Amino acid sequence: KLKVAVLFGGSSEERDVSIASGAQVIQALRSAGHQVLAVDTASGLLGAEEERRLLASKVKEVPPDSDSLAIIRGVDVFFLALHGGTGEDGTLQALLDAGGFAYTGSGHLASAMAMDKDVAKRLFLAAGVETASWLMAPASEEEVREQLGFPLVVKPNSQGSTVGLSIVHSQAELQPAIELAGRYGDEVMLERFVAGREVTVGVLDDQALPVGEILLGGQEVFDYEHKYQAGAVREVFPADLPPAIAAEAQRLALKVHRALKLSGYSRTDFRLDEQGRLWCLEVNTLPGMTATSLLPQAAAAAGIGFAELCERICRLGIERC
Amino acid sequence: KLKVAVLFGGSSEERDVSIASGAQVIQALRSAGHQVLAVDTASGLLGAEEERRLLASKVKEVPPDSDSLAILSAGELAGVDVFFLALHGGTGEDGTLQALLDAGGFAYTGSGHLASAMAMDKDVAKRLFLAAGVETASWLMAPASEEEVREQLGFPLVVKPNSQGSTVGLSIVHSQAELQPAIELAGRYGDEVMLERFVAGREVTVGVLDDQALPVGEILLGGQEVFDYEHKYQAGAVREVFPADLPPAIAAEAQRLALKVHRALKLSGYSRTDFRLDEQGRLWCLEVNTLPGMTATSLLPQAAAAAGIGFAELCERICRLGIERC
Ligand SMILES: Nc1ncnc2c1ncn2[C@@H]1O[C@H](COP(=O)(O)OP(=O)(O)OP(=O)(O)O)[C@@H](O)[C@H]1O
Ligand SMILES: Nc1ncnc2c1ncn2[C@@H]1O[C@H](COP(=O)(O)OP(=O)(O)OP(=O)(O)O)[C@@H](O)[C@H]1O
Ligand SMILES: [Mg+2]
Ligand SMILES: [Mg+2]
Ligand SMILES: [Mg+2]
Ligand SMILES: [Mg+2]
């Protein structure tokens, strides 16, 4: 049995998602007989009552934002149940490196690269993984019409949970979308919109897990509400895909994981067009672990229960560090 | 005037180079009237006496041995406007220290966490070079089989650590039998090892200061295959010519490519990009350095001087670019 500190919370716009991931991981690791310290990185160690309260606090319909978030802003292994910001972009990983601490997920370079959607997409192309055309703001509206056209997606280069993201259907929607994305980070991506199906591939310990599909119905994007509200969307693992397409999504996800030098586990997101082509959006080094999240379902479809998933992640981190 | 803490020394194999860079920066910023604190990151804050002692230490012909290397906000540092990072290699240059400073809310010089980590990873940097339209020699990462090496790289080839500086750990391999000993050597100096095609020809370098290229420099190697630790840091060991005696279109192309590299890796403040110019006139980008040497024999200060920028002014400008970024 291990002594695990589960770090969660943080000060990114994914703080509420992180609280929920942390609460599931804490409960699972305790159920497997480990000693677990619950650490909200915004405040410190929690006692049993505060910790029972956080296990009951479900993600809300909008992310923490504006003034509310501004106000907030012997262990064998640190389980990083953070998402976004310094917890995911390599900053915390470097700090733990410097202190000689073992932790879960990817190292500091890998985490920084995966968080920079632009850089990651250059690396996807270098690894033979197809990805949609993109520009970084500022781009003249002339350059946008010339290279991407509409519809397109505007998104922060380094968010999660669909924070700051808009579909832009015409020139008049473009500036407001860029302004919105710029409230959530310093770089902003404009990316060709890929119509089609929403697919995702988890990786654990350099093996692909069963592909999952998110059934969006009429929605163009998979948004914060549908990601985290129980029952909001049907998510199917293994996805109802032709075997060759599912195999190709798994092959591509492992190529991405290796190209970015990731460790432990990851989750890669794709859009699948009606012509059968997969377009890689991004990869996540600290994917969500909430009760609605995608990676636990991929693991369960592989025959890996949630406590075992958490334990295996811990051991992979110890082995790496 | 600024209050600057110059961080130097460290624990990488480039420690002696960093002591010399830090001594240069300290004296230059003092000439310009700033208040300068000298911090050896391996020990702590230095006094006037040990400044003279430690800082006068000269780079030797060989780097420190493994055994010797294995051997902020506090008091005086209150009110520091910027940390001038006079470190080279290791955690000082690979993004680790930059992330620590980010977490503490401190301003510092050079590039940020991601940019520094990428530029240090020679492999990743070269993938980005190609993505930006910057030519770079073919490479494999160890292990590579005899067939892979023979088919894709050929001999001679270069073996080097993926993340060193100062030509530490690097060998020219002339035949298959030399390959394993070179990989083992490079693996004493980091975790990944690159096998890169050898580019015969001339040795060229381009400094960048805040999104402008500086005059190109050439290092005249004589018969030597590579520019090594001894010849980098012993005064007058090689001639270094700024501006280089190159056809102007070749020098202009080297500057264009260096700026593309600097922008592609999201660097800030300054950098120095190294190229080999092959015998057919084509430039091959080796790497970019986010914390290039600043010693009295170093390349970046000479490129700045050729641009009309004295060393104290260069150091001040770097401080202000770091403060602006942070
Ligand atoms: N180019 C695109 N084409 C179509 N849909 C897109 C595109 N980019 C993003 N989306 C939609 O927006 C959602 C979020 O985008 P993306 O995965 O890039 O960002 P994220 O906020 O980092 O996601 P996560 O919550 O997985 O961290 C996607 O799941 C998809 O529904
Ligand atoms: N592929 C190559 N072909 C020819 N010479 C090479 C090649 N790679 C490296 N060299 C030689 O080795 C030297 C050091 O290589 P490189 O610049 O890649 O490493 P470094 O140790 O990071 O250097 P620096 O001291 O600039 O940090 C070069 O200046 C060059 O003389
Ligand atoms: Mg994401
Ligand atoms: Mg996603
Ligand atoms: Mg170098
Ligand atoms: Mg070099």
UniProtKB/Swiss-Prot annotation, chain A:
<keyword id="KW-0460">Magnesium</keyword>
<keyword id="KW-0547">Nucleotide-binding</keyword>
<feature type="binding site">
    <location>
        <position position="282"/>
    </location>
    <ligand>
        <name>Mg(2+) 2</name>
    </ligand>
</feature>
<comment type="pathway">
    <text>Cell wall biogenesis; peptidoglycan biosynthesis.</text>
</comment>
<dbReference type="GO" id="GO:0005829">
    <property type="term" value="C:cytosol"/>
</dbReference>
<dbReference type="InterPro" id="IPR000291">
    <property type="entry name" value="D-Ala_lig_Van_CS"/>
</dbReference>
<dbReference type="InterPro" id="IPR005905">
    <property type="entry name" value="D_ala_D_ala"/>
</dbReference>
<dbReference type="GO" id="GO:0071555">
    <property type="term" value="P:cell wall organization"/>
</dbReference>
<dbReference type="InterPro" id="IPR013815">
    <property type="entry name" value="ATP_grasp_subdomain_1"/>
</dbReference>
<dbReference type="InterPro" id="IPR011127">
    <property type="entry name" value="Dala_Dala_lig_N"/>
</dbReference>
<dbReference type="GO" id="GO:0009252">
    <property type="term" value="P:peptidoglycan biosynthetic process"/>
</dbReference>
<feature type="binding site">
    <location>
        <position position="269"/>
    </location>
    <ligand>
        <name>Mg(2+) 1</name>
    </ligand>
</feature>
<dbReference type="GO" id="GO:0005524">
    <property type="term" value="F:ATP binding"/>
</dbReference>
<feature type="domain" description="ATP-grasp">
    <location>
        <begin position="121"/>
        <end position="315"/>
    </location>
</feature>
<keyword id="KW-0573">Peptidoglycan synthesis</keyword>
<protein>
    <recommendedName>
        <fullName>D-alanine--D-alanine ligase A</fullName>
        <ecNumber>6.3.2.4</ecNumber>
    </recommendedName>
</protein>
<keyword id="KW-0133">Cell shape</keyword>
<keyword id="KW-0464">Manganese</keyword>
<dbReference type="Pfam" id="PF01820">
    <property type="entry name" value="Dala_Dala_lig_N"/>
</dbReference>
<keyword id="KW-0436">Ligase</keyword>
<dbReference type="InterPro" id="IPR016185">
    <property type="entry name" value="PreATP-grasp_dom_sf"/>
</dbReference>
<comment type="function">
    <text>Cell wall formation.</text>
</comment>
Curated annotation (Swiss-Prot), chain B:
<dbReference type="InterPro" id="IPR011761">
    <property type="entry name" value="ATP-grasp"/>
</dbReference>
<keyword id="KW-0133">Cell shape</keyword>
<dbReference type="GO" id="GO:0009252">
    <property type="term" value="P:peptidoglycan biosynthetic process"/>
</dbReference>
<dbReference type="InterPro" id="IPR011095">
    <property type="entry name" value="Dala_Dala_lig_C"/>
</dbReference>
<protein>
    <recommendedName>
        <fullName>D-alanine--D-alanine ligase A</fullName>
        <ecNumber>6.3.2.4</ecNumber>
    </recommendedName>
</protein>
<keyword id="KW-0547">Nucleotide-binding</keyword>
<feature type="binding site">
    <location>
        <position position="287"/>
    </location>
    <ligand>
        <name>Mg(2+) 2</name>
    </ligand>
</feature>
<comment type="similarity">
    <text>Belongs to the D-alanine--D-alanine ligase family.</text>
</comment>
<feature type="domain" description="ATP-grasp">
    <location>
        <begin position="126"/>
        <end position="320"/>
    </location>
</feature>
<dbReference type="GO" id="GO:0071555">
    <property type="term" value="P:cell wall organization"/>
</dbReference>
<keyword id="KW-0479">Metal-binding</keyword>
<keyword id="KW-0436">Ligase</keyword>
<dbReference type="InterPro" id="IPR000291">
    <property type="entry name" value="D-Ala_lig_Van_CS"/>
</dbReference>
<keyword id="KW-0460">Magnesium</keyword>
<dbReference type="GO" id="GO:0005524">
    <property type="term" value="F:ATP binding"/>
</dbReference>
<dbReference type="Pfam" id="PF01820">
    <property type="entry name" value="Dala_Dala_lig_N"/>
</dbReference>
<keyword id="KW-0573">Peptidoglycan synthesis</keyword>
<keyword id="KW-0961">Cell wall biogenesis/degradation</keyword>
<dbReference type="GO" id="GO:0008716">
    <property type="term" value="F:D-alanine-D-alanine ligase activity"/>
</dbReference>
<comment type="pathway">
    <text>Cell wall biogenesis; peptidoglycan biosynthesis.</text>
</comment>
<dbReference type="InterPro" id="IPR011127">
    <property type="entry name" value="Dala_Dala_lig_N"/>
</dbReference>
<comment type="function">
    <text>Cell wall formation.</text>
</comment>
